Design a protein around this ligand. Structure first.
Ligand SMILES: O=P(O)(O)O[C@H]1[C@H](OP(=O)(O)O)[C@@H](OP(=O)(O)O)[C@H](OP(=O)(O)O)[C@@H](OP(=O)(O)O)[C@H]1OP(=O)(O)O
Ligand SMILES: O=C(O)Cc1c[nH]c2ccccc12
Lengths: 568, 124, 13
C-alpha cells in the first residue's frame, strides 16, 4: 500500500500492544508506525530515556509516565529516591510542541515542570497528577493562567504545597473549556466566588471533585450552576442541621439528572446524607471512604442504589450492611472496604469474613475486591473462590501480621490456594495472614494469569519465592516485604526478572553479595540497593540490604540516584 | 449525468451526486472521465458503495478496493476499507500479520530483538 | 507495631 493508505489503517489501531506488533512486521511498518503513534505509555520512567522516546516517536500527543513503585504509598521508599519528571518535560518541551496530555503517577513534579508545560504546549488539554508530590499552588497558577485549551486538571491523591488558594483565580474570563476538575487533595481554600464563576462559564464541565474547604452550605450554589455534572465530589459534608439548608441541597442535587458518581463526604453528618437519595437510582460509583457514619445510615443509602457498580466504604458498613449490599446491588463489580481504625488491634466494628462471603454469594458480577478485616478462615476463602470463579482482582488485608485461621489456627494456605485454583483469570492478588511456603506452591501451580502479587510477613524459605518466579507465567510486578526470601530464589530465577516490570524486596534476606552478583550477571537490569546505613561495602557481603529494587531497562543505570541508592 | 471510463475502457453512467463522492472525479469534472488506475470490476464495487451511501469480499478484491478509494479520494469508503484492514491487524503477532499480508520480515534477528525489547520493556 | 503496616495511607493518630 501507499504510505498514506498504511498511515490511515494505523489510525484505527490505538492499543499499545497492537502498535508494538505493527512496528515489528517489517522495516517499512516500523517507520510508518513510529511517525503516526499518538500516545505512549511508560509504566516505569527509568525503563527508557526521554531522548529515546522522542527520537523514535516524534508526533506523540499523549504521554503517561509512572515513577516510584507501589510500596512508596506505605512509606517504604525514602524521600529523594527518584521519579523526577523534569528531564521528560524538558526533553518534550522542544520536541512535542503539539503535545496535549500528560498523565503522571508517583512522580516528583515541581513548579518549574508546571511552568515549562504551560509555556511549551499551546494545545495542552489534560493534566493528571496521580499521587505526585513536589509542586505548589504557584505551579497550578501557571497552568490556570496560561493553558487556554485546558480540559482536565486532576490532582488525585497528590501532595501539594498549599501556599494559597488564589491560584484558581488565574483562569481568565475567556477560559470556558474545563471538563474535569479534581482538587480534592488541596488543603487550601480556593476563592469561592472565582470557583462559582469558573463553573458557570464552563458548560462542558462533567466532573467536579471539590476540596474539603468548600463547606456543605455552599454546595447547592455550585450544583445549580452545573446541572449537567456526571461526577461530583462534594466538599465538606457537615453543617448545623437546618430545614432550609437541607431543602436547598436536596433540590440542587435532584436537578442533577446525569450524576452517576458521587464521592467526598468529609465529616459527613447523617442528617444530610438523604439529600443525595434522588441521585442514587442511577448511581454507578459511590465513594464513602471518608464518611464515618454507621452501618444503618450506610444501609439506608445503599438500599436506594440498585445500579451500583463500584462501592468504596469504611468497615462501618459491618457484616449486616454487606448482607444488604449483596441483596440490593446485583450489578456490583468492585467492592473496597477500608479500615476505620487500622491502627487498633481489637475490632471496633462487626466486620468479619462473613461480610465478604455475603457479597461473593449475592453479587454475580463482583470481580474486584479490596477488603481490610481482622479475622479470616480458610472456609470463608474457599466459599468465596467457589462462588466467584470470575474474580480478577482479589486483595485481602488481615490487619494483624501472621494471623492464622481464627477457628482452626491453621495457615491460610488452602484458602488462598482455592482463590488461585478457582479464579482462573485472576490478574491481581495480595495475601496476608499466617502463610507458609505451601501457599506460594499453590500460586506457582495455579495463578497463571496473575500479573501483580503483593506479599508481606509470609513464607518459610526461598522455596516460597522460587515457586512464584518459576510458575507464574504472566507475572509483571512482584513486591515483597518482611519475608524469609533471599539470595537463593532470586539468583536461581534471574532470567525471569527480564520478563517483569520490577521486583521489590524490603526487609527480606537478600545479601549485598547477591545483589552485586545479580547486577554482574544481568547487565540489562538495574539492581538498586536502597539502604540508609551508608556504603554497603562498609558491611560484610553477607549482610542483608534494607531494600532492593530491580527493574529491566533499555536505558542502563539512572543518572539521578541519591546518596543512599547504589546500582549494582 | 456523468460517464466514468475504467482502465478496461468500459463506460459507466452514474448520477452526478454519486460521481462527486470521489474528490478525484470531482476535480476532473463530457466525453468521459478516464480512470486509468481503476479496473471495471473495482469501479463497479465503488459505484455500488457510493450509490448506497459489502466487505464480505476476498483479500485481493479488498486490496484493489482500498487502492481505488485512495486513488479516487472517497473518504467514507477509505475509512471503511482501512478499518477492515486494521481489524485484520488487531490482536495478531507480527508473524501472523505478515502471513495474512504476505510480507517478508526484512529485519536482522538482532534488529528485531532490539525493537521487541524496547517495545515490551518501555512501551507496553 | 510495624512501619507501613497495615498498608494504608491514613495518618496515625
Ligand atoms: O496496568 P499497570 O501499570 O500494572 O497499573 C495498575 C492498574 O492501573 P492502570 O489503570 O494505571 O492500568 C491497576 O488498575 P486495574 O488494571 O486493576 O483496573 C491499579 O490498581 P487500582 O485499581 O488500585 O488503581 C494499580 O495501582 P496500585 O498499584 O496503586 O493499586 C496499577 O499499578 P501501578 O501501581 O503500577 O500504577
Ligand atoms: O493490596 C493491598 O493494598 C493490601 C495488601 C494485602 N496484602 C498485602 C501485602 C503487601 C502490601 C499490601 C497488601
Amino acid at each position: 500500500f501507499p504510505e498514506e493508505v498504511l498511515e490511515h489503517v494505523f489510525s484505527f489501531i490505538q492499543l499499545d500492544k497492537d502498535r508494538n506488533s505493527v512496528s515489528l512486521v517489517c522495516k517499512s511498518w516500523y517507520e510508518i508506525e513510529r511517525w503516526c503513534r499518538r500516545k505512549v505509555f511508560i509504566g516505569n520512567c527509568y525503563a527508557v530515556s526521554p531522548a529515546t522516546v522522542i527520537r523514535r516517536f516524534p508526533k506523540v500527543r499523549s504521554v503517561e509516565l509512572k515513577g516510584k513503585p507501589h510500596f512508596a504509598d506505605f512509606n517504604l521508599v525514602p524521600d529523594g529516591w527518584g521519579g523526577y519528571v523534569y528531564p521528560w518535560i524538558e526533553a518534550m518541551s522542544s520536541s512535542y510542541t503539539w503535545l496535549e496530555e500528560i498523565r503522571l503517577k508517583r512522580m516528583v513534579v515541581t513548579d518549574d515542570c508546571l511552568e515549562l508545560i504551560a509555556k511549551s504546549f499551546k494545545n495542552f488539554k489534560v493534566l493528571v497528577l496521580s499521587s505526585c508530590e513536589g509542586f505548589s499552588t504557584d505551579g497550578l497558577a501557571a497552568i490556570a493562567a496560561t493553558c487556554r485549551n485546558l480540559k482536565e486538571l486532576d490532582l488525585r491523591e497528590s501532595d501539594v504545597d498549599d501556599v494559597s488558594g488564589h491560584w484558581l483565580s488565574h483562569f481568565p474570563d475567556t477560559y470556558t473549556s474545563l471538563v474535569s476538575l479534581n482538587i480534592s487533595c488541596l488543603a487550601s481554600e480556593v476563592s469561592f466566588s472565582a470557583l462559582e464563576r469558573l463553573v458557570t462559564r464552563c458548560p462542558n464541565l462533567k466532573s467536579l471533585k471539590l476540596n474539603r474547604a468548600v463547606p456543605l452550605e455552599k454546595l447547592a450554589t455550585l450544583l445549580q450552576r452545573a446541572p449537567q455534572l456526571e461526577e461530583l465530589g462534594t466538599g465538606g459534608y457537615t453543617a448545623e442541621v437546618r430545614p432550609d439548608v437541607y431543602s436547598g441541597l436536596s433540590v440542587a442535587l435532584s436537578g442533577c439528572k446525569e450524576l452517576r458518581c458521587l464521592s467526598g463526604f468529609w465529616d459527613a453528618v447523617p442528617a444530610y446524607l438523604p439529600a443525595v437519595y434522588s441521585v442514587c437510582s442511577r448511581l454507578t460509583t459511590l465513594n464513602l471512604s471518608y464518611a464515618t457514619v454507621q452501618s444503618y445510615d450506610l444501609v439506608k443509602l445503599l438500599c436506594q442504589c440498585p445500579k451500583l457498580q463500584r462501592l468504596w466504604v469504611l468497615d462501618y458498613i459491618e457484616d449486616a450492611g454487606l448482607e444488604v449490599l449483596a441483596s440490593t446491588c446485583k450489578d456490583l463489580r468492585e467492592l473496597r472496604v477500608f479500615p476505620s481504625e487500622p491502627f487498633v488491634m481489637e475490632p471496633n466494628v462487626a466486620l468479619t469474613e462473613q461480610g465478604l462471603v455475603s457479597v461473593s454469594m449475592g453479587c454475580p458480577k463482583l470481580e474486584s475486591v479490596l477488603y481490610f478485616c481482622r479475622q479470616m478462615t480458610n472456609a470463608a476463602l474457599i466459599t468465596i473462590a467457589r462462588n466467584r470463579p470470575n474474580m480478577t482482582r482479589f486483595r485481602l488485608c488481615i490487619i494483624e501480621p501472621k494471623a492464622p485461621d481464627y477457628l482452626t489456627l491453621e495457615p491460610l494456605d488452602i484458602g488462598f490456594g482455592a482463590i488461585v485454583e478457582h479464579c482462573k483469570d485472576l490478574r491481581r492478588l495480595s495475601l496476608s495472614g499466617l502463610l507458609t511456603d505451601k501457599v506460594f506452591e499453590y500460586i506457582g501451580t495455579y495463578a497463571k494469569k496473575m500479573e501483580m502479587l503483593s506479599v508481606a510477613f509470609a513464607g518459610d524459605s526461598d522455596l516460597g519465592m522460587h515457586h512464584v518466579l518459576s510458575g507464574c507465567d504472566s507475572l509483571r510486578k512482584l513486591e515483597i516485604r518482611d519475608c524469609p526470601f533471599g539470595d537463593k530464589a532470586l539468583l536461581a530465577n534471574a532470567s525471569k526478572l527480564e520478563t517483569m516490570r520490577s521486583l521489590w524486596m524490603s526487609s527480606c534476606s537478600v545479601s549485598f553479595g547477591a545483589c552485586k552478583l545479580l547486577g554482574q550477571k544481568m547487565p540489562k537490569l538495574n539492581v538498586e540497593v536502597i539502604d540508609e546505613r551508608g556504603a554497603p561495602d562498609s558491611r560484610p557481603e553477607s549482610c542483608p540490604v534494607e531494600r532492593v529494587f530491580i527493574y529491566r531497562t533499555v536505558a542502563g543505570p539512572r543518572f539521578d540516584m541519591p546518596g543512599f541508592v547504589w546500582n549494582m | 449525468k456523468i460517464v466514468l471510463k475504467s482502465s478496461d475502457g468500459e463506460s459507466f453512467e452514474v448520477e452526478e451526486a454519486v460521481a462527486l463522492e470521489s474528490q478525484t472525479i470531482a476535480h476532473m469534472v463530457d466525453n468521459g472521465v478516464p480512470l486509468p488506475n481503476v479496473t471495471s470490476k473495482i469501479l463497479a464495487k465503488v459505484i455500488e458503495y457510493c450509490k448506497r451511501h459489502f466487505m464480505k469480499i476476498d483479500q485481493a478484491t479488498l486490496f484493489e478496493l482500498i487502492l481505488a478509494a485512495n486513488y479516487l479520494n472517497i473518504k467514507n469508503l477509505l475509512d471503511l476499507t482501512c478499518q477492515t484492514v486494521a481489524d485484520m491487524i488487531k490482536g495478531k503477532t507480527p508473524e501472523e500479520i505478515r502471513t495474512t499480508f504476505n510480507i517478508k520480515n526484512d529485519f536482522t534477528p538482532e534488529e528485531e530483538e532490539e525493537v521487541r525489547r524496547e517495545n515490551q520493556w518501555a512501551f507496553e | 507495631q510495624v512501619v507501613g503496616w497495615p498498608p494504608v495511607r491514613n495518618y496515625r493518630k
